[PDB]
Amino acid sequence: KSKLPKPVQDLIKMIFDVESMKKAMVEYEIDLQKMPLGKLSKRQIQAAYSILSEVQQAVSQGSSDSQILDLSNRFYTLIPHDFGMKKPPLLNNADSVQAKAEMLDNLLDIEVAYSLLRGGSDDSSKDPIDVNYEKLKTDIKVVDRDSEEAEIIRKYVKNTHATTHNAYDLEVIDIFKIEREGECQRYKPFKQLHNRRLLWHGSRTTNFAGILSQGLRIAPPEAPVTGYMFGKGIYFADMVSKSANYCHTSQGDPIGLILLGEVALGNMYELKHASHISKLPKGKHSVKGLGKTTPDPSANISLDGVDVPLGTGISSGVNDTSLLYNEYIVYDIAQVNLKYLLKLKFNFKT
Numbered sequence: 001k002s003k004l005p006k007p008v009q010d011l012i013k014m015i016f017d018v019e020s021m022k023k024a025m026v027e028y029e030i031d032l033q034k035m036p037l038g039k040l041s042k043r044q045i046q047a048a049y050s051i052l053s054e055v056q057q058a059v060s061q062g063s064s065d066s067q068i069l070d071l072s073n074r075f076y077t078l079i080p081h082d083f084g085m086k087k088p089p090l091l092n093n094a095d096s097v098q099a100k101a102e103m104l105d106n107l108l109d110i111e112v113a114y115s116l117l118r119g120g121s122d123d124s125s126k127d128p129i130d131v132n133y134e135k136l137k138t139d140i141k142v143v144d145r146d147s148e149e150a151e152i153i154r155k156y157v158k159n160t161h162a163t164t165h166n167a168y169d170l171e172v173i174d175i176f177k178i179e180r181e182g183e184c185q186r187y188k189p190f191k192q193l194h195n196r197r198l199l200w201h202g203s204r205t206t207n208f209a210g211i212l213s214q215g216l217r218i219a220p221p222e223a224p225v226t227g228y229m230f231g232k233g234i235y236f237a238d239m240v241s242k243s244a245n246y247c248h249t250s251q252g253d254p255i256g257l258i259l260l261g262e263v264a265l266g267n268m269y270e271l272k273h274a275s276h277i278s279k280l281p282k283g284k285h286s287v288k289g290l291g292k293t294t295p296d297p298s299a300n301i302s303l304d305g306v307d308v309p310l311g312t313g314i315s316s317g318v319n320d321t322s323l324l325y326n327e328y329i330v331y332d333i334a335q336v337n338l339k340y341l342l343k344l345k346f347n348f349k350t
């Protein structure tokens with residue numbers, strides 16, 4: 001039987017859960033009859049992303065209703081949905097294009113998980129757990145509840161989470177220390193960059209096999225840009241509040257996963273409203289979206305040069321921002337070093 005700790009074994013079961021894959025699809029109104037799990041394909045997804053982009057273009061120019069009707073139909077031909085009656089919605093706004101793309105990113109990470117899950121030898125020599133654990137190519141270790149690491153973390157979560165957006169309370173079930181294959185070398189260079197911070201990154205749990213296996217990625221060129229306030233990059237937050245909302249949990253499934261990554265920010269190009277960057281000003285190596293709420297600066301703590309902004313949570317200098325919280329975007333995957341993964345339980349106040 002498996003050598004991995006219990007909590008780790010349970011983490012594997014979680015991310016490699018097939019029923020979760022199906023649930024995510026059915027929750028997208030996807031006909032699993034026509035578009036079964038094993039039918040998903042990278043290529044089918046690039047195509048869908050490209051249709052999505054065309055829609056945005058059509059939406060921006062003000063295309064002639066029929067062009068938006070064929071683009072809409074082209075999308076539902078690619079991604080088979082079930083409505084029965086009423087008919088499929090028209091994709092005629094930045095709003096629908098953002099939802100559909102978000103769904104494609106998720107569906108793509110699910111294709112990756114089902115594909116890893118299937119690839120490799122299925123010889124019962126070793127148990128499913130240890131095997132599927134190998135597939136992630138990252139070293140996972142439990143962090144003891146009573147370690148300074150855990151304490152630092154729990155405090156970061158409590159301080160940066162407030163009664164304001166208190167729709168739920170957060171319980172840290174497990175925290176893991178993680179080191180992906182090749183994150184030690186790829187980062188070593190970018191580490192020679194100042195302003196290194198330990199930030200949050202929340203994502204749906206169905207995306208975790210794909211995130212650990214391939215790392216955080218930047219949207220493909222065919223992806224529409226609507227939805228990326230500061231362009232195609234990797235986003236983080238310094239308040240568990242902002243990230244936790246991307247875990248998409250509910251009273252039905254109240255437990256989610258969230259990452260803590262060390263990101264070498266360099267000089268930050270500060271902005272208050274959306275701006276499609278990607279091409280930064282000289283001397284800038286990251287973008288910082290200024291929010292209304294910041295963790296209290298005085299309480300910031302350190303580590304090997306990695307600042308942990310675990311300050312409680314206060315109003316910031318500028319409120320004339322379109323942001324409730326801060327955002328941090330880097331446009332190079334090498335500027336990211338994932339260090340911890342946390343299993344969180346959401347207790348909704350409802």
Ligand SMILES: C[C@@]1(c2nc3cccc(C(N)=O)c3[nH]2)CCCN1
Nearest residue numbers: 200201202228235236237243246327
């Ligand atoms: C780009 C977008 C995103 N923006 C973020 C800002 C801070 C943190 C995160 C995160 N993933 O924790 C963000 N994710 C928008 C909707 C889904 N992805």
